[PDB]
Curated annotation (Swiss-Prot), chain A:
Family stated for the protein in its record: Belongs to the bacterial ribosomal protein bL34 family.
InterPro entries in alphabetical order: Ribosomal_bL34 (IPR000271), Ribosomal_bL34_CS (IPR020939)
Protein name: Large ribosomal subunit protein bL34
UniProt key word Ribonucleoprotein: yes
Coiled-coil blocks: none
NCBIfam families found in the cross-reference section: rpmH_bact
Keyword Ribosomal protein: yes
A molecular function (GO) term: structural constituent of ribosome
GO annotation, biological process: translation
Organism: Escherichia coli O45:K1 (strain S88 / ExPEC)
Curated annotation (Swiss-Prot), chain B:
The protein's name in its UniProt record: Large ribosomal subunit protein uL2
UniProt GO molecular function: RNA binding; rRNA binding; structural constituent of ribosome; transferase activity; zinc ion binding
PROSITE patterns for this protein: RIBOSOMAL_L2 (PS00467)
InterPro entries: NA-bd_OB-fold, Rib_uL2_dom2, Ribosomal_uL2, Ribosomal_uL2_bac/org-type, Ribosomal_uL2_C, Ribosomal_uL2_CS, Ribosomal_uL2_dom3, Ribosomal_uL2_RNA-bd_dom
Residue spans of biased composition, Low complexity class: 38-47
Length: 46, 271
RNA sequence: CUUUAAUGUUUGAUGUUCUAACGUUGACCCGUAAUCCGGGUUGCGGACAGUGUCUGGUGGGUAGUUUGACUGGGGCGGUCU
RNA sequence: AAUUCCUUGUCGGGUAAGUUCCGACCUGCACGAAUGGCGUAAUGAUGGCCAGGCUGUCUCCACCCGAGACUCAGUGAAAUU
RNA sequence: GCUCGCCGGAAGACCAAGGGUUCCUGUCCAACGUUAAUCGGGGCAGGGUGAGUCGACCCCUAAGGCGAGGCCGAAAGGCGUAGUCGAUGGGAAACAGGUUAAUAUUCCUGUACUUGGUGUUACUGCGAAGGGGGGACGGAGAAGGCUAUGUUGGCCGGGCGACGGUUGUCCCGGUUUAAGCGUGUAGGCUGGUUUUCCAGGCAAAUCCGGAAAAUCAAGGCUGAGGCGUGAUGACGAGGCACUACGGUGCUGAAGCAACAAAUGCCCUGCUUCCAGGAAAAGCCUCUAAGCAUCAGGUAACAUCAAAUCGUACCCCAAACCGACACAGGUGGUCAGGUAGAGAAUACCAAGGCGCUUGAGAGAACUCGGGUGAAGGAACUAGGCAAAAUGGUGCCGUAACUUCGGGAGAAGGCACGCUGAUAUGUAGGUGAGGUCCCUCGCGGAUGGAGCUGAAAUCAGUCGAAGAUACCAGCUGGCUGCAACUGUUUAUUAAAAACACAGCACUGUGCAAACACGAAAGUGGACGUAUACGGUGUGACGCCUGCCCGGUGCCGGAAGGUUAAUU
RNA sequence: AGGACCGAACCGACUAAUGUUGAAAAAUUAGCGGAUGACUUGUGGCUGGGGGUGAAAGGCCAAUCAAACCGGGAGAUAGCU
C-alpha cells in the first residue's frame, strides 16, 4: 500500500524552500504574510 | 527487394520488409553526426501541440548537403548508408581536395560513380546545375525555391519534379501532387529521381512495429464523451452529425489554404 | 423633348509598367568569441500582402438564461376570457 | 438471430421427461453491405450446451486433529440511551 | 546452563534514500510497553563518530531552470542570444593483520600509490578563446579460456568410545594469506617505413584528410588468468599460568595435490539483425598572435602540501511511508551442503529467532484441516467449492488449415536396490619420460593419476519404486472479437478501447493544424512514397439503387442588400 | 528468429472463503494472467483547474473530481425545516 508522502529533501527544498519563494513575485508575498502573522518558522528549510 | 516473412507467429504473418544489401553495415561517419532529442509533441509552453507522438528508438542527426554548393571539384561515391531521419538513403562522397559530405542518393547511384556541380557540369544523374542550363523536359529532384536557400522539393523516396516550360526568368515545374509552380530559373536542381523507390511496398505487420517509430495510439472521436469531442456521446452507436475536427471545423471537403502572398507563383492546383 | 455624334469638366472601374513606402523564416560584412537582435551591401516581391477604426454574413467553439398552472400522486388527454 | 412482440412458432436430433442447445423453414412486429455484409485456421482468467474420469456438492450425515467459544488470574473498549 | 522448535534466495549480512542520539556504560520502575518487570528503542547522568586514497566539495556536460543586451506585452510580466546553474552520466590515487564497553580501508603494525609547489643538474623552441584525434556508447546469440567457490585425496594435531563391533579401506578438526611490483600468456584488432605534392580542415601547420612513387615484410596496440616477489612476515589446531571464573599473557605442528565449476572476468571482444543506438571536459597532437642569452618544455634527485564538511545507530525494518511496538509498501549488492533442470521445492550450515498475556477444561456453534460404508451431480441459477490429472525416455496421434499449426491432441509401455559386460564402459581432464626448438607462460609424441553418464543381461524386496515436497483434467457442437496488448486506484477486465490493414479529405513550405492579446514554439532540423483530421478494423469473396431533405464544393446573367457619399 | 511455448524473481488482479466497531480507511489464504517486451524499475525534469493528461472508464490530478485545495466577496440567498 504505497502512500502519498514519499520524502525527499532535495525536492522539498526545490519546491517550498526559501530561495524558491523569493524568485517569484507571488512567492515573496507568502513570506510577507507569514512575517506579519508572526510565524516562528517561515519556510521548510531546516 | 521485398521479402515476405513466414507466419511462425501471429505478429510475423503479415510483415513485408524492404532489405537493401548494399547499405553500409558499420557505424556512420563521426564528424558529420549531431545530437537531436525527442520532443513528444510538446512545445516551449509545455503543452501538447501535435498529437500521437512520443517514444521510439534513439537517433542521431546526419548533416546532409542540401545546397550542393562547391563547384568545379569532382567527387566519388564511397558507400550508401541508412539514414533514420528520412525515408530516402544517403551517400558519402569524397571530394578531390579531401573533403567528405553526405548527399541524397539518386536512383541508380553506386559506389565508384562521379558527381559534379556548377554551371559547366554534364547532364548525368547526381549532378547539380541551375535550371537555366537544364533542358526543358528533364526529370529532377532536390529542387530549390530561392537561389542559395537549399533544396526543398522532391526529397522523399522515389519522388521527382518535371520541367514543363521556361518563360524568361521563370521555369514551370510539375510537382508530385500534379501542381504547376513557377520558380526562378537561377535555382539549382539535381538530375534524376530519388532512390529507395520500393519504400512504399513495406508492411509493418503488428502494433508494436509502429511504436518503434514514435507513433502513439489514435482514439476515434466517436468513442469519447460529448464533453471531449464534438463526435462523442451516444447510447449504442449513434452519430447523427457532420464530421469535424476535435476543435469543431469541417474535416471533409473544406479548403483551408488562405495565403495571398504566394498565389502568383501557382499556375494550377492539384485538384 | 425622343433618338444621336462631336470639342471640353467630374471622376468610377480594367489591365500594363516603374520604385522610393512596406515584406523577406535568400546571400554576404560588422558589433562579435553569438543560427537571437541591430546596422550596411545585394537579389526577389511591391503599392499587393498585412495591421487599426467602422461595417454585412457565418459562428453551441464559449457564456448567461428560459422552458406556466389546474390535476382524486406526476406524465399523456382536456381546460384557462 | 447479442435483433423475432405474438412465442415455450413449426419440423428433426439429443433426454424416461429439454422455456436452454445443434440443424432447417420463412410469416424479417423492427437484418443487410466501410455507424461495413457473409465466412474464417490459430488465440481467450470470453457467453451457451453435451460427454468420460472424479468426488461429502447431495441422499444423510458420522468420527477425529488444531484455533476461539466455556472456568480461573492481570489489563480493559463500542455503537445505543 | 542443558534440551526442544522455526527461517535459511531469509525471518542471514552490506549499501542508498529517510530519520537523528534510538548507539555504550551506571542508575530508577511513577507515567509509556495491550499482562507482571529486577527488563526496554522508557526517566536521569556520563561517554562515543579521528581520512592525501570512501562520499561530498571540485573540473565537465544531458533533460531542464535562470538570463546582461534583445523581441514582445494595459501594468504585473512572456520568450530568448552571449553566458551561468543543473546527475540519475564522464575525470588521480590503499591493501592485509591487530585493537575499544561503544569508531575505524579513518587509530596502530607492515608493504604501497596519485596529483601539484619549490630547489639543483642536464638537454631542448615554447605558446589558444583556434584545427585534428580520442573520450564515444544498440538488441540478441554462441563458443573458447579462466577465477570465485566446492568435493575428494595427501599432510599435521587429537580419539580408541555409556549398549553388540570399532588399530582400521575407522572418527573429529585444520590445511589461510591482500593491494603493489616483474613477467606479457589464452586470445582480440591492425600491414609497417621513407620521400614529393594539394582547390580541403575559416588564417598557419611538421597534425588530420587526399594524391604519386620506392622499400620491407613483420612491426605495433589491447589483454583475463598463471608464475616469481610482497612473505625468514602475519594467521593458525592446540597446549600452558593465573583469574578481580569476564578474561589477560607465552608458545604454536601442517599449511600440498587432483577433479568439478558460475548468471562473475577476458568481453566496450566475436557473429548477426534493423528499430540504426548521448554531450562536454580530463588526455594526445598541431600551429597563429607574441618571446626569443628570457620565459617556457622533457628528464633524474631532494623536499613540501593535499584544506573544509559526513563518519555513532536503524541493514526490506519496533528507529523509513502507513495516527500504533500496525499480518501492508521500500531501489541495489552477497549467494555454502545433499536431492533437483533450477535463484522452484524438502532438510540443514554461518547467522538469527520462538512473533510482550498466561493456567485449565475438552459442550452447542463458528473458522482451518483428515478420513468415510452403498450410490455418483440425484445438489444448484450454474459441477460454485472440493475431488481428480501432474516427471523423464520411447511408441502413437483425427476433422480442419492462412501449410506455421491443431498437438504435450487422444492413448500406451518402462522407472527401486544389487551383480556382471567393465576388479569403472563411451567420454572429459591430464603428470612423468622422449624428441625438436627461433629456447619459451614453446611444439609434437606419450600416457600414470583423477572424474565418469547411459544401456543390456541376471537376481531381489514391498500392497505400492515419477513412493515425500514439487508437478496439465480431457474430448465434441456453437455466439463474439482476427491475434500479444489497454481499461472504470477501492462492487463492471468484457463482445468495450487500441491494433497492423483500407478509404475519403486538407496541406507547395513563412505548409495545413495546435499552445499563445504578441514575440515565439511544436509539426520538422521533415518536403506529397511527407504531415494533419475523420470513419472502418487481420485475412478470403464483395461493397448494389437514391442528390428530393441537411451539409459541403464550383459559377455569377438577373432581384434584394451594410458602413460610405 | 519470435509483440514465440512451459515456468521462479518482477508486474498484475479472474474465482471462492475469512475479515466488515478488521491485523489492514481495499488486506490475508488457496488456486490465477504476462513474464525479451506496445515490458518493468531508480533518480531528476516538464504540462495547473473551465485547465492538464487520457490504448477513452467521465478515468486520474496528494485517502477529495460531471470541474482540485487554501484564502477572500461573505453574516451570498433560503416564499423551506
Ligand atoms: Mg523551455
Ligand atoms: Mg490507423
Ligand atoms: Mg465511452
Ligand atoms: Mg459540444
Ligand atoms: Mg442502436
Ligand atoms: Mg437515425
Ligand atoms: Mg518588381
Ligand atoms: Mg495593402
Ligand atoms: Mg485590406
Ligand atoms: Mg451553452
Ligand atoms: Mg444570475
Ligand atoms: Mg403541476
Ligand atoms: Mg391522477
Ligand atoms: Mg423470447
Ligand atoms: Mg425431437
Ligand atoms: Mg435431461
Ligand atoms: Mg423427445
Ligand atoms: Mg443433464
Ligand atoms: Mg423440439
Ligand atoms: Mg441446464
Ligand atoms: Mg438454431
Ligand atoms: Mg436458417
Ligand atoms: Mg427490412
Ligand atoms: Mg446492424
Ligand atoms: Mg453503412
Ligand atoms: Mg464488426
Ligand atoms: Mg459472420
Ligand atoms: Mg476455440
Ligand atoms: Mg489477453
Ligand atoms: Mg466455453
Ligand atoms: Mg454435442
Ligand atoms: Mg456428467
Ligand atoms: Mg467417483
Ligand atoms: Mg449434509
Ligand atoms: Mg484464534
Ligand atoms: Mg461512552
Ligand atoms: Mg526448519
Ligand atoms: Mg524458498
Ligand atoms: Mg543521511
Ligand atoms: Mg531520548
Ligand atoms: Mg541500560
Ligand atoms: Mg509493581
Ligand atoms: Mg505495565
Ligand atoms: Mg533509554
Ligand atoms: Mg575518490
Ligand atoms: Mg552540487
Ligand atoms: Mg541549456
Ligand atoms: Mg528565460
Ligand atoms: Mg532583459
Ligand atoms: Mg557548470
Ligand atoms: Mg552523480
Ligand atoms: Mg567518473
Ligand atoms: Mg593511511
Ligand atoms: Mg564495559
Ligand atoms: Mg558498531
Ligand atoms: Mg586497514
Ligand atoms: Mg592507518
Ligand atoms: Mg591502536
Ligand atoms: Mg577540441
Ligand atoms: Mg557512456
Ligand atoms: Mg555489436
Ligand atoms: Mg580454484
Ligand atoms: Mg558402545
Ligand atoms: Mg562395547
Ligand atoms: Mg578429513
Ligand atoms: Mg595441510
Ligand atoms: Mg596471443
Ligand atoms: Mg581541448
Ligand atoms: Mg558504521
Ligand atoms: Mg537503513
Ligand atoms: Mg533482513
Ligand atoms: Mg508486539
Ligand atoms: Mg510490521
Ligand atoms: Mg541451494
Ligand atoms: Mg523434479
Ligand atoms: Mg474442538
Ligand atoms: Mg469443518
Ligand atoms: Mg462416501
Ligand atoms: Mg477404509
Ligand atoms: Mg468406496
Ligand atoms: Mg465412476
Ligand atoms: Mg439437475
Ligand atoms: Mg433439484
Ligand atoms: Mg472450480
Ligand atoms: Mg485439490
Ligand atoms: Mg479444436
Ligand atoms: Mg497451470
Ligand atoms: Mg445463440
Ligand atoms: Mg480480443
Ligand atoms: Mg490497472
Ligand atoms: Mg473496480
Ligand atoms: Mg495502397
Ligand atoms: Mg491526397
Ligand atoms: Mg468499430
Ligand atoms: Mg474486412
Ligand atoms: Mg453503400
Ligand atoms: Mg442535395
Ligand atoms: Mg443538385
Ligand atoms: Mg455557394
Ligand atoms: Mg513471449
Ligand atoms: Mg501465453
Ligand atoms: Mg508462462
Ligand atoms: Mg503452477
Ligand atoms: Mg474485479
Ligand atoms: Mg471475488
Ligand atoms: Mg505467477
Ligand atoms: Mg495470490
Ligand atoms: Mg520520481
Ligand atoms: Mg480539460
Ligand atoms: Mg490531450
Ligand atoms: Mg457513461
Ligand atoms: Mg462550476
Ligand atoms: Mg468567506
Ligand atoms: Mg448562512
Ligand atoms: Mg454581499
Amino acid at each position: 500500500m504505497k502512500r502519498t508522502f514519499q520524502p525527499s529533501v532535495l525536492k522539498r527544498n526545490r519546491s517550498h524552500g526559501f530561495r524558491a519563494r523569493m524568485a517569484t513575485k507571488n512567492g515573496r508575498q507568502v513570506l510577507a504574510r507569514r512575517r506579519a502573522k508572526g510565524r516562528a518558522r517561515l519556510t521548510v528549510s531546516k | 527487394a521485398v521479402v515476405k516473412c513466414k507466419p511462425t507467429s501471429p505478429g510475423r504473418r503479415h510483415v513485408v520488409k524492404v532489405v537493401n544489401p548494399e547499405l553500409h553495415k558499420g557505424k556512420p561517419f563521426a564528424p558529420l553526426l549531431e545530437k537531436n532529442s525527442k520532443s513528444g509533441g510538446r512545445n516551449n509552453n509545455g503543452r501538447i501541440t501535435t498529437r500521437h507522438i512520443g517514444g521510439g528508438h534513439k537517433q542521431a542527426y546526419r548533416i546532409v548537403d542540401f545546397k550542393r554548393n562547391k563547384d568545379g571539384i569532382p567527387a566519388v561515391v564511397e558507400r550508401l548508408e541508412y539514414d533514420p531521419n528520412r525515408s530516402a538513403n544517403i551517400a558519402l562522397v569524397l571530394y578531390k581536395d579531401g573533403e567528405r559530405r553526405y548527399i541524397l542518393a539518386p536512383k541508380g547511384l553506386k559506389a565508384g560513380d562521379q558527381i559534379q556541380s556548377g554551371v559547366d557540369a554534364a547532364i548525368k544523374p547526381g549532378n547539380t546545375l541551375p535550371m537555366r542550363n537544364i533542358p526543358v523536359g528533364s526529370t529532377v529532384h532536390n529542387v530549390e525555391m530561392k537561389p542559395g536557400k537549399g533544396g526543398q522539393l522532391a526529397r522523399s523516396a522515389g519522388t521527382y519534379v518535371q520541367i514543363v516550360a521556361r518563360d524568361g526568368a521563370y521555369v514551370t515545374l510539375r510537382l508530385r501532387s500534379g501542381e504547376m509552380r513557377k520558380v526562378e530559373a537561377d535555382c539549382r536542381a539535381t538530375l534524376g529521381e530519388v532512390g529507395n523507390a520500393e519504400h512504399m511496398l513495406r508492411v509493418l505487420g503488428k502494433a508494436g512495429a509502429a511504436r518503434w517509430r514514435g507513433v502513439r495510439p489514435t482514439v476515434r472521436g466517436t468513442a469519447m464523451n460529448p464533453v471531449d469531442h464534438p463526435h462523442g456521446g451516444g447510447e449504442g452507436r449513434n452519430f447523427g452529425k457532420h464530421p469535424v475536427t476535435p476543435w469543431g471545423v469541417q474535416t471533409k471537403g473544406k479548403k483551408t489554404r488562405s495565403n495571398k502572398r504566394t498565389d502568383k507563383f501557382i499556375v494550377r492546383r492539384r485538384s
